[PDB]
Amino acid sequence: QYLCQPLLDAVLANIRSPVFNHSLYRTFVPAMTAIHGPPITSIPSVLQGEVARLDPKFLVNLDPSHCSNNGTVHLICKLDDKDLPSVPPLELSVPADYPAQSPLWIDRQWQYDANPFLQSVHRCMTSRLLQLPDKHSVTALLNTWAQSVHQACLSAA
């Protein structure tokens, strides 16, 4: 701005000439080189990060079935915990570009029938799924699953 303007006017006047840097060189390099001397002397890794940090309750493994080494990935988890009862395995479909979007829980209504207890597990799980914020992780789904199993143990007894 002040005390520097005519340089700025000269250089902004003379941009887009192909001989521009020639002009700068010819007008500036002999002074500088006299004073200053001569010049100088398969699976996306976000999911591996999630699975590597899970609690040893969960036992997440890939589905033998379904497409592999391609966009989306598919998981069959498990649940081991003395406090919690054995439950249906749970099926997850993680999209490619996994963060910035929410994974999907593959619903299997037919195995969550044939007991009152698994029905309570399923109702409570769909409730906490509706309660979830958007763009949640895989671990949010797995933890809502474990909390759903715990509530269905407590509500029953």
Partner 1 sequence: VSVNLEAFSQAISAIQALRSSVSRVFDCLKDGMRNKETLEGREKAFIAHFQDNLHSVNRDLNELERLSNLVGKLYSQLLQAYKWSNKLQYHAGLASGLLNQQSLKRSANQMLVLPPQYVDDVISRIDRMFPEMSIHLSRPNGTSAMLLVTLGKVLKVIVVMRSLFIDRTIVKGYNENVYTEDGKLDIWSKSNYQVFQKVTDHATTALLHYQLPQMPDVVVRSFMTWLRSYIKLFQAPCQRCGKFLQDGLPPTWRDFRTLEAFHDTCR
Partner 2 sequence: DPVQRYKMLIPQLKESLQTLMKVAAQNLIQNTNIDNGQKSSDGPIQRFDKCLEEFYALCDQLELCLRLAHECLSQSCDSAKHLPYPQYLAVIKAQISCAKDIHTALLDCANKVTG
Contacting partner 2 within 97-116 (CB under 8 A) = none
Contact 137, 83 (CB under 8 A): no
The angle at the Cα of 50, spanning 133 to 126, to the nearest 5 degrees, equals: 35
Q: Is 4 in the site for partner 1 (CB under 8 A)?
A: yes
- φ, ψ at 51 (rounded to 5°): -70, -30
Q: Does 25 bind partner 1 (CB under 8 A)?
A: yes
CA-based nearest residue to 92, from 82, 80, 78, 81: 78
* Site string (30-69) toward partner 2, x via CB under 8 A: xx--xx----------------------------------
Among 9, 20, 104, 155, the residue binding partner 1 under the rule CB under 8 A is: 20
Tell which positions 2-31 bind partner 2, by CB under 8 A: 3-7, 9-11, 13-14, 17, 19-20, 22-24, 26-28, 30-31
Please give the size of the binding site for partner 2, defined by CB under 8 A.
Answer: 23
Strand order in the sheet with 73-76: 61-62, 73-76, 91-94, 104-106
Length of the chain: 157
Chain positions contacting partner 1, by CB under 8 A: 1-4, 7-8, 11-12, 15-16, 20-21, 24-25, 28-29, 31-32, 36
